[PDB]
């Protein structure tokens, strides 16, 4: 469901916080299904994505940090209230749609 | 490692004029 977000001018969790294309992008985008390789019966959680970020990432900009996220913006610890881990794991199963 | 310098003067941020400097080639086309 996130493949459609790999395109210039898109919005979403991937386009905002993970990967963005320029409005004047020149190139090609290729995607193919890998359910046989990247999915398992017990579930594959090795792939992640950033779900929380204060500002949208710029075109072709990358953010590989892992800092606890607070909507207020102050530093916090994960056990504290309103403090989360920005990275969420994809749950890839064989039986997934 | 990570050595520190003691008894340092503040920079005071002196100001100057750019003059005509800072021009760079805008593209790869020969003109």
């Amino acid at each position: 469901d996130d493949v459609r977000q790999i395109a210039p001018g898109q919005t979403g969790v991937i386009a905002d916080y993970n990967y963005k294309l320029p409005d004047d992008f020149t190139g090609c985008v290729l995607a193919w299904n890998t359910r046989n390789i990247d999915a398992t019966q017990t579930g594959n959680y090795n792939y992640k994505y950033r779900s929380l970020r204060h500002g949208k990432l710029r075109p072709f900009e990358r953010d590989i940090s892992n800092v606890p996220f607070s909507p207020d913006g102050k530093p916090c610890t994960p056990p504290a209230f309103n403090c989360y881990w920005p990275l969420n794991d994809y749950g890839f199963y064989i039986t997934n749609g | 490692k990570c050595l520190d310098f003691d008894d340092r003067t503040p920079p005071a941020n002196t100001q100057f004029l750019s003059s005509h400097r800072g021009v760079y080639y805008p593209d790869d086309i020969f003109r």
Binding site: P8, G9, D23, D24 | -
Partner: protein, 49 residues
Amino acid sequence: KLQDVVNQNAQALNTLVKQLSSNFGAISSVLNDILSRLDPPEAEVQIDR
């Protein structure tokens, strides 16, 4: 004859102002409306018109 000359000059400038409300194949003649609503790629098509 002198009045006709001054009338034509004023009429030409007033026609110029009224033609700013003109769409030319665009969604709107208001430049701010287009820019507040579209990306630079999509607004480029309307602004060029």
